[PDB]
Amino acid sequence: NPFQFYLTRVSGVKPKYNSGALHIKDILSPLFGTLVSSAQFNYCFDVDWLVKQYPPEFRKKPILLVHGDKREAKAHLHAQAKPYENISLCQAKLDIAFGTHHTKMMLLLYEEGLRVVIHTSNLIHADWHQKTQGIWLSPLYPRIADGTHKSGESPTHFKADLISYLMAYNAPSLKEWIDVIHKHDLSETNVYLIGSTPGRFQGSQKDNWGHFRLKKLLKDHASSMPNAESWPVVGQFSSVGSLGADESKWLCSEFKESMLTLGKESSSVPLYLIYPSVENVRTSLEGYPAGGSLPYSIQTAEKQNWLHSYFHKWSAETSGRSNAMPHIKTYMRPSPDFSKIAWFLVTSANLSKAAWGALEKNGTQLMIRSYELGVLFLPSAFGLDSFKVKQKFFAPMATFPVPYDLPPELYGSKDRPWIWNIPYVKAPDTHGNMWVP
Template sequence: MSQEGNYGKWTISSSDESEEEKPKPDNPSTSLLPCAGQRAAYEPRYTCSEARKAAHRRKISPVKFSNADAASDAKRQKSGSQEELGWCLSSSDDELPPEAQQKAAEKVVVKEEKGVSSPKDNAAPRAGNHGPPAHHVLEEDEYETSGEGQDIWDMLDKGNPFQFYLTRVSGIKAKYNSGALHIKDILSPLFGTLVSSAQFNYCFDVDWLIKQYPPEFRRKPILLVHGEKREAKAHLHAEAKPYENISLCQAKLDIAFGTHHTKMMLLLYEEGLRVVVHTANLIRADWHQKTQGIWLSPLYPRIAHGTHTSGESATHFKADLISYLTAYNAAPLQEWIDIIQDHDLSETNVYLVGSTPGRFQGGQKDDWGHFRLRKLLREHAASTPSAEAWPIVGQFSSIGSLGADASKWLCSEFKETLATLGRDTRAPGKGVAPLHLIYPSVENVRTSLEGYPAGGSLPYSIQTAEKQSWLHSYFHKWSAETSGRSNAMPHIKTYMRPSPDFSRIAWFLVTSANLSKAAWGALEKNGAQLMIRSYELGVLFLPSAFGLDSFRVKPRFFSGGQEPAASFPVPCDLPPELYGSKDRPWIWNIPYTKAPDTHGNMWVPT
């Protein structure tokens, strides 16, 4: 559907939900293609959101920046102005009126680079296409692991009691990848002799995934747990068919606009079991130049036969993980439930926070979603003097429909959860517990390592944004100088409660859950029922599980052992920086043609 308004002309879908939070179409869309016959060249091999498809197309066939007023545009770029970078939702006096914006847009010469062969042809594009080759750059495996032998063990075992990591990023200084992990590291034989694995995720590139396993493990049994339906499911099965060792498990999604968004690995070794909870899709783009989070469990030993021990931790992680897997009600997962039962998870020091689809009442309300987080914070977070002054910081890569104003969900039930600190916590009043929401601006995306295509993993749509312009007053820029990753766009999702001076945090959560009611749940029936649409999973770090009252904030994420071991490596800068008057949140499905990105391209999504 084509529309034209104050923000220019764009093509949008009709859903109110973010792309990442709505079901994938039964028939993969061809709306982004010059013609359906070129679909193989312009769409990824895996099913994904429309935003991801647009980014994939623009990497293959970039729209080069060309403007009659190039000199003045360059001057604006140098000064950092976003005055004409794209859309706006405010009414400040220094913005161009709609008519002037339209005239400025007409000056742009949209020059789309052609000459792209099908990815399956493994052919380079014609000379003159300054974008990445269709197959070689987008699909080829070009990574190195983080280290060899003892180096990885040292990284995992020394000076990191939290076992929280970021993913390796291509194109940044080596020191900012020190201690970071690639998926090849996680699947490395240095971690154990793999027997079988289960991969829970939203998006799979099966061929790419298999190549991430060491050659000696590529024929070991792999279970893919997914949420695909109908034709998308058939497509995934077709992708997996050449691999006899792959089996698939479909997660039931009985509520509209729900997704299987959980990102977890279960790795069974001859030496034991490991659980990995992370934020990356199983596609190359998510492990290349994006900021992702990873929690690695200890290597859980098998419980010796005849030993009378439950293998449970103080955080009840084992029981909660089994409850989460049981909620799928899927036969293929029973084997993994039995495997977990047979292992000792007592060394776990994090809490599991999951979401599963359904409508929950009574005591079941506390089992899932943000009510699960509220229960853990009430029972295990330390009560803090003047807790109402401690800010709330949330950071995410996608946003759902949150209602006509802040009181509908964000600053009522959800904020009440995030503001909970101990049993004596009162519901947050107006103006207390400041709320800082970190979401990349247009300028963040434009100046990123990937340029505008990085915005394909930030599927906030114009139709959703226009309905909740009130939300944008809470927005803060993405900044990660502490980890050297300000230019690596975040797909990580974190929530935390820092002190007013941002030197300490009361708790930290890394999760797959974005800012949406679909992910976290929303109350129904006058608060008697919690409705959740999606599967999500995260781990909660509470100081009490580490014998502390609070965590110190680690000044530099990759600074090694210079700070006390209890310093938590927060992956974004604190305090967050509020959007300036000309900053705008990234919206994926409208064009940005007033300034080039780091590759000299514009963003024209359709």
């Protein structure tokens, strides 16, 4: 694999569907490196559980938890960590209202080098048990020799871009990790970093983050093909924000416009959004409790019923994961027959203005509320014009492992989007229960 894109292990599926999947215990194993220290960026943590995922011999190495919690939530996280004197905390500043620290990333410093893991799972048992989640594993980055002056930079600029992402926190604990990254050679990295950080970005900074960062990378490092208008956009996510009273407010004006960019020159493009139906959740491995990790409120949904006409069912026969509800987020640009893709992104970013950014000030400023992080696979970074789509996820350097089924299937007339804070009492789930929140 040039791509090093993995799914998490799913408990209960046949072993053939976990061959080449990774559990957190595999990622932290001594086989991956001799751990010196680590940073865990995430949203939600079960600290007792997390420490148990490290090998016993590594459980007292320093761990930094990077989170966004405030007030009582912050106090609860500190109380979780206080029995472990090797655990330090970094509170990411969230100075714009209604923002979240969503980024899921591990920085793993070893005796042998450095590894970066950008993934989609919270650090709690449920997120690694029976969900569909995505993982990108960096190479083992060697240390640059003392006194050697080299950039250690990749053709995708990943080293400087990761440092730039960390610099936005303005945090002393992350400056130490910046200095660690400076000392390592990341030149083998073949993905582009796409982050979101909170702020109001104008001028050149406009292109640093969010959907303008995606747009810039697609303009600079992809090429437009004939009939590009027929290549769909696919977005796939676990949470839905308030997008406005109609599709022209944001979804099909600035968001789609960024997503359909290819090349440097200058819309009928089909837009497929994949999000679990109520039936998807009810019949899932977890049952209705899977919907506790699919946050879409009735208050949000009832103001944008227009959106649900874009919604397609979760289906993942290709990876044996149709009943493993998605907490991965992915965006990609398939060909009209879905046999090829022009790019693929795995990220923390859900379908929300908070995550991707919303233009302000007459289109001159991009406002982002949250921290998000993903990695972009572009054919040009692999010496290719496009990626073939892998037919069976677990069945090579030209063939990208898309983890769910194509083409996506539209909701039926009786399907509804999973909405997490209303009851479902008409048909029981796989554990025999109803949903009464």
